[PDB]
Write an enzyme that holds these catalytic residues in place. Structure first.
Site, mmCIF file in Angstrom:
data_model
loop_
_atom_site.group_PDB
_atom_site.id
_atom_site.type_symbol
_atom_site.label_atom_id
_atom_site.label_comp_id
_atom_site.label_asym_id
_atom_site.label_seq_id
_atom_site.Cartn_x
_atom_site.Cartn_y
_atom_site.Cartn_z
ATOM 1 N N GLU A 176 -4.767 14.463 -5.070
ATOM 2 C CA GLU A 176 -4.457 13.077 -4.777
ATOM 3 C C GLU A 176 -2.988 12.851 -4.464
ATOM 4 O OE1 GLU A 176 -6.371 10.637 -4.114
ATOM 5 O OE2 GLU A 176 -8.207 10.790 -5.277
ATOM 6 N N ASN A 195 -3.185 1.848 3.360
ATOM 7 C CA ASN A 195 -4.407 1.941 4.142
ATOM 8 C C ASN A 195 -4.385 0.754 5.100
ATOM 9 O OD1 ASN A 195 -5.772 4.155 2.447
ATOM 10 N ND2 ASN A 195 -5.418 2.583 0.883
ATOM 11 N N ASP A 211 -7.762 -1.612 5.633
ATOM 12 C CA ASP A 211 -8.171 -2.711 4.776
ATOM 13 C C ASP A 211 -7.005 -3.365 4.054
ATOM 14 O OD1 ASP A 211 -7.604 -0.754 2.888
ATOM 15 O OD2 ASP A 211 -9.516 -0.903 1.863
ATOM 16 N N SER A 253 -4.935 -2.154 1.814
ATOM 17 C CA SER A 253 -4.764 -1.820 0.401
ATOM 18 C C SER A 253 -3.819 -0.625 0.311
ATOM 19 C CB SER A 253 -6.100 -1.474 -0.259
ATOM 20 O OG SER A 253 -6.608 -0.268 0.270
ATOM 21 N N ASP A 273 -2.774 2.895 -2.239
ATOM 22 C CA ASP A 273 -3.111 3.793 -3.336
ATOM 23 C C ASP A 273 -1.793 4.096 -4.043
ATOM 24 O OD1 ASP A 273 -5.802 3.971 -2.390
ATOM 25 O OD2 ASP A 273 -5.081 5.392 -0.901
ATOM 26 N N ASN A 285 -6.373 2.650 -6.158
ATOM 27 C CA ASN A 285 -6.353 1.603 -5.124
ATOM 28 C C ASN A 285 -6.143 0.145 -5.575
ATOM 29 O OD1 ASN A 285 -8.177 -0.211 -3.064
ATOM 30 N ND2 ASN A 285 -7.019 1.378 -2.003
#
Length: 130
Positions: free
Chosen positions: A35, A46, A49, A51, A53, A60
């Site tokens: 990750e 991102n 959308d 958002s 992380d 998220n």
């Protein structure tokens, strides 16, 4: 902070991650590795959308932590996403435990399905004394 492999394994162990909801420490290590590369400061936007992380587990902002700029946020961990960028990972761990309490469990993290599931993951904890 970028954790050294065994340093992280011992840290997760102390924080009660070994066997949490049936998930072994090696599985958690594999997740962190892929990750973020064990980097607490890691972030990834991102654009699709809107958002982001956050942190070592790339949690998220649409569902778990609040950053105030993500459309339709839920804040299931009841945490500021800022808490997920600290060198101290206690908050990240508390939120990760919340994530895996959903039905999917560890499967909630797509990276785990792609890089860890059905694979030999012992390598991540070997030599760490955990």
């Amino acid at each position: 902070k970028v954790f050294e492999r065994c340093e992280l394994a011992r840290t997760l162990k102390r924080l009660g991650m070994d066997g949490y909801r049936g998930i072994s420490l090696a599985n958690w290590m594999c997740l962190a590795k892929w990750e973020s590369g064990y980097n607490t400061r890691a972030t990834n936007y991102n654009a699709g959308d809107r958002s982001t992380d956050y942190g070592i587990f790339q949690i998220n902002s649409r569902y778990w932590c609040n950053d105030g700029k993500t459309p339709g946020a839920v804040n299931a961990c009841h945490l500021s996403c800022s808490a997920l960028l600290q060198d101290n990972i206690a908050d990240a761990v508390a939120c990760a435990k919340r994530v895996v309490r959903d039905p999917q469990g560890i499967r909630a993290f797509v990276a785990w399905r792609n890089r860890c599931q059905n694979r030999d993951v012992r390598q991540y904890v070997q030599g760490c004394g955990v």
